[PDB]
Design a protein around this motif. Structure first.
Motif, PDB file in Angstrom:
ATOM      1  N   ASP A  61      -7.458  11.222   6.468  1.00 53.39           N
ATOM      2  CA  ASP A  61      -6.667  10.607   7.072  1.00 53.39           C
ATOM      3  C   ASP A  61      -5.330  10.765   6.218  1.00 53.39           C
ATOM      4  N   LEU A  62      -4.180  10.174   7.116  1.00 55.61           N
ATOM      5  CA  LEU A  62      -2.932  10.214   6.487  1.00 55.61           C
ATOM      6  C   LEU A  62      -2.676   9.375   5.609  1.00 55.61           C
ATOM      7  N   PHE A  63      -3.314   8.251   5.488  1.00 58.05           N
ATOM      8  CA  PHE A  63      -3.190   7.250   4.316  1.00 58.05           C
ATOM      9  C   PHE A  63      -3.884   7.943   3.043  1.00 58.05           C
ATOM     10  N   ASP A  64      -4.933   8.518   2.939  1.00 59.79           N
ATOM     11  CA  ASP A  64      -5.584   9.029   1.993  1.00 59.79           C
ATOM     12  C   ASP A  64      -4.935  10.200   1.535  1.00 59.79           C
ATOM     13  N   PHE A  65      -4.202  11.052   2.232  1.00 58.82           N
ATOM     14  CA  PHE A  65      -3.491  12.238   1.961  1.00 58.82           C
ATOM     15  C   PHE A  65      -2.273  11.640   1.212  1.00 58.82           C
ATOM     16  N   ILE A  66      -1.303  10.742   1.805  1.00 56.67           N
ATOM     17  CA  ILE A  66      -0.170  10.116   1.019  1.00 56.67           C
ATOM     18  C   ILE A  66      -0.726   9.408  -0.347  1.00 56.67           C
ATOM     19  N   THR A  67      -1.564   8.569   0.069  1.00 58.24           N
ATOM     20  CA  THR A  67      -1.957   7.918  -1.343  1.00 58.24           C
ATOM     21  C   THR A  67      -2.353   8.951  -2.415  1.00 58.24           C
ATOM     22  N   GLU A  68      -3.004  10.228  -2.305  1.00 54.60           N
ATOM     23  CA  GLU A  68      -3.146  11.092  -3.214  1.00 54.60           C
ATOM     24  C   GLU A  68      -2.212  12.199  -3.623  1.00 54.60           C
ATOM     25  N   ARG A  69      -1.124  12.588  -2.680  1.00 53.22           N
ATOM     26  CA  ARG A  69      -0.325  13.391  -2.917  1.00 53.22           C
ATOM     27  C   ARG A  69       1.117  12.716  -3.202  1.00 53.22           C
ATOM     28  N   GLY A  70       1.417  11.455  -2.848  1.00 54.08           N
ATOM     29  CA  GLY A  70       2.560  10.635  -3.150  1.00 54.08           C
ATOM     30  C   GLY A  70       3.461  10.960  -1.906  1.00 54.08           C
ATOM     31  N   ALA A  71       4.970  10.533  -1.915  1.00 51.03           N
ATOM     32  CA  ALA A  71       5.723  11.131  -0.970  1.00 51.03           C
ATOM     33  C   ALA A  71       5.778  12.330  -0.569  1.00 51.03           C
ATOM     34  N   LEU A  72       5.845  12.820   0.833  1.00 53.61           N
ATOM     35  CA  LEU A  72       5.751  14.036   1.368  1.00 53.61           C
ATOM     36  C   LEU A  72       7.113  14.847   1.325  1.00 53.61           C
ATOM     37  N   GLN A  73       7.115  16.251   1.250  1.00 48.19           N
ATOM     38  CA  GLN A  73       8.308  17.090   1.079  1.00 48.19           C
ATOM     39  C   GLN A  73       8.665  16.854   2.722  1.00 48.19           C
ATOM     40  N   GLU A  74       9.870  16.959   2.905  1.00 45.22           N
ATOM     41  CA  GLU A  74      10.455  16.521   4.335  1.00 45.22           C
ATOM     42  C   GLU A  74      10.131  17.551   5.256  1.00 45.22           C
ATOM     43  N   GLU A  75       9.923  18.997   4.951  1.00 44.05           N
ATOM     44  CA  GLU A  75       9.483  19.926   5.589  1.00 44.05           C
ATOM     45  C   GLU A  75       7.913  19.526   6.379  1.00 44.05           C
ATOM     46  N   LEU A  76       7.150  18.996   5.188  1.00 44.41           N
ATOM     47  CA  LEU A  76       5.878  18.580   5.570  1.00 44.41           C
ATOM     48  C   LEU A  76       5.759  17.363   6.556  1.00 44.41           C
ATOM     49  N   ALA A  77       6.661  16.359   6.268  1.00 45.07           N
ATOM     50  CA  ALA A  77       6.821  15.196   7.141  1.00 45.07           C
ATOM     51  C   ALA A  77       7.272  15.537   8.536  1.00 45.07           C
ATOM     52  N   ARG A  78       8.200  16.338   8.586  1.00 41.73           N
ATOM     53  CA  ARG A  78       8.842  17.006   9.908  1.00 41.73           C
ATOM     54  C   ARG A  78       7.641  17.442  10.609  1.00 41.73           C
ATOM     55  N   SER A  79       6.856  18.219  10.095  1.00 45.77           N
ATOM     56  CA  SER A  79       5.854  18.685  10.736  1.00 45.77           C
ATOM     57  C   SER A  79       4.829  17.830  11.251  1.00 45.77           C
ATOM     58  N   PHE A  80       4.441  16.854  10.317  1.00 47.07           N
ATOM     59  CA  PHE A  80       3.604  15.777  10.787  1.00 47.07           C
ATOM     60  C   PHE A  80       4.060  14.896  11.783  1.00 47.07           C
TER      61      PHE A  80
END
Ligand SMILES: CC(C)Oc1cccc(/C=C2\SC(=O)NC2=O)c1N1CCC[C@@H](N)C1
Length: 273
Positions: A96-115
């Motif tokens: 899930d996205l909560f776990d993903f962000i918890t594990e990886r921290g702030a997302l690169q904008e290219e990734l955040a844009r796709s999501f």
């Protein structure tokens, strides 16, 4: 029955939504999620096109049901003396996205844009089907890790989409708009845009922008991470205090920050490898 058709695996999670178990459909080994919702905890009830009394969650899931992978598919449902059991699809591998962000921290904008683009397409699908999710947040988004495809889940706080005012809410408070906090009134689309602003901030900063009711009402957006000017502008627009100052879904998707989105497969290849 239900017990013969499904092999029950480990508990995946529990909370306001009920208890969710991992499972396998015995016939074709299809990975599934088995969601148990207790009857005494169901406040909103509805009716199917046939006329059966089922939870609103089942009505909403059937309305959004389609081959479009951006929204969870309800495979089957069962009534028990004190509960309802929902059989939902389960991508594998998934996070899930909560776990993903918890594990990886702030997302690169290219990734955040796709999501973010994929979430927008999923929310437009719900709205086109006459469904308002009412709980758009990181915990309610699954990432299909192999395909780079996101899925909107959990219609347990949702409602039929209407153009009149909503005066009830049981979604996540920290994602709720200032008009709900101040007046206990909101309109579906503009409240959904506010929650999308919270979600986008969460993706690019690695945490939500507001904690307290006072912070939500003030609506002063502070960026704790380095975020591009176009992304900050889009976030601040979604988080406009006045609901009529918020962008529509079309204006969000036409924003300069939303241009040149990666395909889900390109997203998986670059960021989920
Ligand atoms: C194992 C993966 C990461 O989790 C899941 C996969 C497939 C379905 C669900 C849950 C669903 S589907 C739906 O409409 N309502 C649900 O409650 C699920 N959840 C487990 C509990 C915690 C939650 N955030 C993610």
């Amino acid at each position: 029955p239900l017990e013969s058709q499904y092999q029950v695996g480990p508990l995946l999670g529990s909370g306001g939504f009920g208890s969710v178990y991992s499972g396998i459909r015995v016939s074709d080994n299809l990975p599934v999620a088995i969601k148990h919702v207790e009857k005494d905890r169901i406040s909103d009830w509805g009716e199917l096109p046939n006329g059966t009394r089922v939870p609103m969650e089942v009505v909403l899931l059937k309305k959004v049901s389609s081959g479009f992978s951006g929204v969870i598919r309800l495979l089957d449902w069962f009534e028990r003396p004190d509960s309802f059991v929902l059989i939902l699809e389960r991508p594998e591998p998934v996070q899930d996205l909560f776990d993903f962000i918890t594990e990886r921290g702030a997302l690169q904008e290219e990734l955040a844009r796709s999501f973010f683009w994929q979430v927008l397409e999923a929310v437009r699908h719900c709205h086109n089907c006459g469904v308002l999710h009412r709980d758009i947040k990181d915990e309610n988004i699954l990432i299909d890790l192999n395909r780079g495809e996101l899925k909107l889940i959990d219609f347990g706080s949702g409602a039929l989409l209407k153009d009149t005012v909503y005066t009830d809410f049981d979604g996540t408070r920290v994602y709720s708009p200032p008009e709900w906090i101040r007046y206990h009134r909101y309109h579906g689309r503009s409240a959904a845009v506010w929650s999308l602003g919270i979600l986008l901030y969460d993706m690019v900063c690695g945490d939500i922008p507001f904690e307290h009711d006072e912070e939500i009402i003030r609506g002063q957006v502070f960026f704790r991470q380095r975020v591009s000017s176009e992304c900050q502008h889009l976030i601040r627009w979604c988080l406009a205090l006045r609901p009529s100052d918020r962008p529509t879904f079309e204006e969000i998707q036409n924003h300069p920050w939303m241009q040149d989105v990666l395909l889900p497969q390109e997203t998986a290849e670059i960021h989920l490898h």
